[PDB]
C-alpha cells in the first residue's frame, strides 16, 4: 500500500509469485529447451499409420 515494485505484476515474462526463496512462478517465458531421446519402439509405426 506504499509498495515498491510488485514483481508478481512487474517481473518480465508473465510471472506471478507466491512465497518463494527466489522463484518466479507462472512466468510466460523462461523457455526450457527440451530434447528427448525417444526409443524407436515408443513410436507408432509408419505402416501402422
Amino acid at each position: 500500500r506504499d509498495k515498491g515494485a510488485p514483481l508478481n505484476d512487474v517481473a518480465p515474462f508473465g510471472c506471478s509469485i507466491a512465497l518463494e526463496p527466489l522463484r518466479a512462478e507462472n512466468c510466460a517465458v523462461g523457455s526450457i529447451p527440451i530434447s528427448i531421446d525417444i526409443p524407436d519402439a515408443a513410436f507408432t509405426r509408419i505402416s501402422e499409420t
Partner: protein
C-alpha cells in the same frame, strides 16, 4: 526422431509438439513447459514486517 522442442516456459499452455520422422510414423508429443521453476539455494537473512 530425437524430438527437440523449445517453447516459452509458459504455465498454462499445452503446446502439442510433433516428432518428425520417416523411419517410424511421426508421433505427437506435448512439450508443455508448465510452470516456471527456478529454485536455487537461498539463505534467510532477515524477516522484515
Amino acid at each position: 526422431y530425437e524430438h527437440t522442442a523449445v517453447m516459452p516456459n509458459k504455465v498454462g499452455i499445452p503446446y502439442k509438439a510433433l516428432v518428425e520422422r520417416p523411419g517410424y510414423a511421426p508421433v505427437h508429443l506435448q512439450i508443455q513447459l508448465v510452470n516456471t521453476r527456478i529454485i536455487p539455494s537461498t539463505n534467510l537473512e532477515y524477516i522484515t514486517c
